[PDB]
Amino acid sequence: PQTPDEASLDLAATDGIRLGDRLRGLWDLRLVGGDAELPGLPREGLQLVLDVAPKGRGLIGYLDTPERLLAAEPPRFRVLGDLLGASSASIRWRLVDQASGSVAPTHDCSAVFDEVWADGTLSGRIQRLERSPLSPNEDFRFVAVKRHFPLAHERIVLNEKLLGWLVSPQHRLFHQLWHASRDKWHRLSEKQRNALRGVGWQPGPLDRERDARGPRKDRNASGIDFFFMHRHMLHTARSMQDLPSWERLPRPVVPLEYDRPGFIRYFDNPDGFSVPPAWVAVDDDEYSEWLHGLKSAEAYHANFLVWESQYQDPAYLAKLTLGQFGSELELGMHDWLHMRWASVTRDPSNGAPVMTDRFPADFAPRWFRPENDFLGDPFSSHVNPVFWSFHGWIDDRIEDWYRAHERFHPGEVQRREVEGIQWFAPGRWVEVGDPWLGPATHGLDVETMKLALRIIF
Amino acid sequence: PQTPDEASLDLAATDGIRLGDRLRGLWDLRLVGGDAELPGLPREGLQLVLDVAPKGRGLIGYLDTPERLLAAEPPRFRVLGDLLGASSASIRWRLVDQASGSVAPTHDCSAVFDEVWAGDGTLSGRIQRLERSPLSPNEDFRFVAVKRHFPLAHERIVLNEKLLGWLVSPQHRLFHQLWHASRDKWHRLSEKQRNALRGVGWQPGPLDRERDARGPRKDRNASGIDFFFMHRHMLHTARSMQDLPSWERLPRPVVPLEYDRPGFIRYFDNPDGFSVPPAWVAVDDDEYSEWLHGLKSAEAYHANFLVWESQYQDPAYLAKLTLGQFGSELELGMHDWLHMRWASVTRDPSNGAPVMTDRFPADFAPRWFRPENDFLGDPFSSHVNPVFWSFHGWIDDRIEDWYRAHERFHPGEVQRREVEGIQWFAPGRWVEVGDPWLGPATHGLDVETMKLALRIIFS
Numbered sequence A: 001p002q003t004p005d006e007a008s009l010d011l012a013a014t015d016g017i018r019l020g021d022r023l024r025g026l027w028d029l030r031l032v033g034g035d036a037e038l039p040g041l042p043r044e045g046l047q048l049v050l051d052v053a054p055k056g057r058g059l060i061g062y063l064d065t066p067e068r069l070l071a072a073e074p075p076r077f078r079v080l081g082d083l084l085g086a087s088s089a090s091i092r093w094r095l096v097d098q099a100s101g102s103v104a105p106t107h108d109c110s111a112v113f114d115e116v117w118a119d120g121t122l123s124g125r126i127q128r129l130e131r132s133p134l135s136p137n138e139d140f141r142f143v144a145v146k147r148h149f150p151l152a153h154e155r156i157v158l159n160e161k162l163l164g165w166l167v168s169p170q171h172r173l174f175h176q177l178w179h180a181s182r183d184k185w186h187r188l189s190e191k192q193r194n195a196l197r198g199v200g201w202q203p204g205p206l207d208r209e210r211d212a213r214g215p216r217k218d219r220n221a222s223g224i225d226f227f228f229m230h231r232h233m234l235h236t237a238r239s240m241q242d243l244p245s246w247e248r249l250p251r252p253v254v255p256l257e258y259d260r261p262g263f264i265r266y267f268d269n270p271d272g273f274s275v276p277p278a279w280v281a282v283d284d285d286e287y288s289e290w291l292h293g294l295k296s297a298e299a300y301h302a303n304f305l306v307w308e309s310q311y312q313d314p315a316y317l318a319k320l321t322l323g324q325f326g327s328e329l330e331l332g333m334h335d336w337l338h339m340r341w342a343s344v345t346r347d348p349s350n351g352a353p354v355m356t357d358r359f360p361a362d363f364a365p366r367w368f369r370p371e372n373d374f375l376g377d378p379f380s381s382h383v384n385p386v387f388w389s390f391h392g393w394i395d396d397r398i399e400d401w402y403r404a405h406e407r408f409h410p411g412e413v414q415r416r417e418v419e420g421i422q423w424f425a426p427g428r429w430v431e432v433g434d435p436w437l438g439p440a441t442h443g444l445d446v447e448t449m450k451l452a453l454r455i456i457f
Numbered sequence B: 001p002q003t004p005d006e007a008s009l010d011l012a013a014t015d016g017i018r019l020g021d022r023l024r025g026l027w028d029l030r031l032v033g034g035d036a037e038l039p040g041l042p043r044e045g046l047q048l049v050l051d052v053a054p055k056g057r058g059l060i061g062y063l064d065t066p067e068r069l070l071a072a073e074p075p076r077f078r079v080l081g082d083l084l085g086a087s088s089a090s091i092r093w094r095l096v097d098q099a100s101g102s103v104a105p106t107h108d109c110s111a112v113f114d115e116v117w118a119g120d121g122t123l124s125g126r127i128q129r130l131e132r133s134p135l136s137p138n139e140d141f142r143f144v145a146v147k148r149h150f151p152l153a154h155e156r157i158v159l160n161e162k163l164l165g166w167l168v169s170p171q172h173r174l175f176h177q178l179w180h181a182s183r184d185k186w187h188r189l190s191e192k193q194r195n196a197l198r199g200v201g202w203q204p205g206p207l208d209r210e211r212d213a214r215g216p217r218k219d220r221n222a223s224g225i226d227f228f229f230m231h232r233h234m235l236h237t238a239r240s241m242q243d244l245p246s247w248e249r250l251p252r253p254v255v256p257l258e259y260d261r262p263g264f265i266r267y268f269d270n271p272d273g274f275s276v277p278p279a280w281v282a283v284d285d286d287e288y289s290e291w292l293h294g295l296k297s298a299e300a301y302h303a304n305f306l307v308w309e310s311q312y313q314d315p316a317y318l319a320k321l322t323l324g325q326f327g328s329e330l331e332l333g334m335h336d337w338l339h340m341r342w343a344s345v346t347r348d349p350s351n352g353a354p355v356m357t358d359r360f361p362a363d364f365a366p367r368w369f370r371p372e373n374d375f376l377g378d379p380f381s382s383h384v385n386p387v388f389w390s391f392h393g394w395i396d397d398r399i400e401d402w403y404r405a406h407e408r409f410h411p412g413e414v415q416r417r418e419v420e421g422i423q424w425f426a427p428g429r430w431v432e433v434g435d436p437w438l439g440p441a442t443h444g445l446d447v448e449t450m451k452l453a454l455r456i457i458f459s
């Protein structure tokens, strides 16, 4: 056999990328055995922090007490390893004694990854490199447990008044149905359309419906409905609680290489704005790869950072009517904002992860509990505290669109109050003047909305 | 026409990646015009720092005085823009007044990128106050930026007169080139050429039992032992003239501008000389340019260099290799990549301007022998680069990890020994041969002879 003639960029594959994602984070460590002792460290109450680049094959980390990991001084032990030939069955890394004054490894570690559904488990053995392998077996083993990634609602608390208004069946169904009709109107048969008209849930004015995802979606003023309704939802919600809008989009997690305490803090999700780790959908690899990149860091620099720039650039906004700006923003950024900060679908009763997303027609009573705040569903997305941070951001950009036109087209856009909400008069850049707030404007009953949703799905 | 039905990951392309690389770095800014004024900032002595992700399309940065950019407090102005439809012809970004208490842009900027070979780049354009109306008389608000020179290694790591004089000597430049040339090319030489190298005593290794370095049996012919020993021999004599500490760890890639603004700036001053020099676009050779670019990228550090740093310090990994294997494996993969990762653009010996055409291996003009030539991509000059000795010291230290690894799994099967006044190891189960090749000295300097041998190989 012949060895390679030169080195070649060895980017991680799907299996290697997924392995690194199982490891990246903060772990609580425990030493077991008669010979289980690390210089200057207890046997209990330890932590293991690890990190792997998005497509990297090298493994890094640190092993010390919780306080020392956050302190600026170099931790007592540093991790170095690689994932070549690694898997859930075998992972290996070495420990460097930062106090010994030498980068030479002092210990050799192996581990196996497991899953417990009663966020991760690592267990294996450690070997002192000074000890000889021909000596009696050394009872040195460890067990690690990946620390729970806090949910948004576990860090941003919505008071009972507001939260009670969101989780109400009269509101969950409204939001789902408000999106459902316009999202699917362009694919409904005439029989279905006539039925929605029979209950007053046609998207927009009767016989002049504004489909949201049809061919004329950009020109049919549908965007005006999206902006206005969600601003209407903000106004009433902000009267019950202070809901500051995002000023900037949260940056991706800082690598463990450059800010060890910051990296650790990110996995505690202190401000609730941390990107939840992606989850692998069963028997749907195309969707899993889609969600993964949507949450990656290169998607932040390739897409989310471009949107934050475009929708605050005057020259870019001055070219769009409110109907265009809304439809463009909703179809691209809005849908991606939800899934980027979306956590895994969970059972409302117990909170354990549920791989199968809720069926749109499933109206069981358990789904109505406050535990269900899945951002991937309009029936529950409005419950997530992050929902209101980035929808406040979107709304504020409407003023950038007004300021832009006053610069390039002074006078062609006029403000106006509509339904007790600051808005704009119909004109050259405002296609229509009757925003669609459901049957209230172009016609709540809970049993009716269940029917309408049943018609659609 | 129909608008997109959903968003799709829009990673930068070749043209977009190259644009972001032209911008990333620290610029010296200067405002020109009658209406050229930023609240709380002078017109002269400014700096513009910018950054772009490896495959990103969004542009960020800061604009303030040199001192404030390094200070911990938020700079006076923050940059936001994108590179959609941008190029050397048009680049646009907005400025945010961080003091105003609002993330709303206060100014709108455009610029054109230029190159001057008479600085590493030039940006010039106009700025517009967004409060001012466009129907008003034209505002004389423009700026000019000049990308700051990326310091070379030898501009920050100084080799004393004794050592530097020994490296740039014609008797040493040719030795290093020829020592690599023969074994690197031996497996492709005709018998006529081989006999000639034997006629001058420059056959790689023992006569009639030559150790090709890049042939099929490269891993089993003990050639790796030649690579490790010679460069350790080079270290020993070099470290007698100057203290040259070896790398303990491989320098991490530059910190993104989002997480450490002062650190990002410091990296582009190359303070310790270990900063990765930016890649250069080779003319009419896109395959090599893409290769060099990735070799220097950050994902190559996490995919390759960090794996090598792990493997060659893992006992279980080293215990499976004989020294001849460990040498051949490391040289063909890591060694060659370490050179090109920290390599700067080839420069003319006369002046510091870049020369796109690498020196011809047969070109022995007198100008190439000046100390200015420290191109890491050529053995004729790689030993002059100060970084050369940092990572070659690292490689050498890994040989001891290879001994400690065998002493753990195979105690006694590897024995130390002194060879040519150098700490080494005795021939055995894991040491294939006991006559390292230090050139004609061991298996046989004359400057005219080495010039001949090199001419035989390349012409």
Ligand SMILES: N[C@@H](Cc1ccc(O)cc1)C(=O)O
Binding pocket: A179, A335, A336, A338, A339, A375, A376, A377, A378, A379, A381, A382
């Ligand atoms: N869940 C949809 C988008 C969406 C999310 C929340 C909503 O409220 C409405 C729509 C998706 O797959 O992106």
Ligand SMILES: N[C@@H](Cc1ccc(O)cc1)C(=O)O
Binding pocket: B180, B335, B336, B337, B339, B340, B376, B377, B378, B379, B380, B382
């Ligand atoms: N020139 C080789 C690397 C190299 C450089 C200097 C040497 O001394 C040896 C090898 C390359 O293209 O990577």
Ligand SMILES: [Zn+2]
Binding pocket: A334, A338, A381, A391
């Ligand atoms: Zn939404």
Ligand SMILES: [Zn+2]
Binding pocket: A175, A179, A230, A378
């Ligand atoms: Zn909604």
Ligand SMILES: [Zn+2]
Binding pocket: B335, B339, B382, B392
């Ligand atoms: Zn070298």
Ligand SMILES: [Zn+2]
Binding pocket: B176, B180, B231, B379
């Ligand atoms: Zn060399």
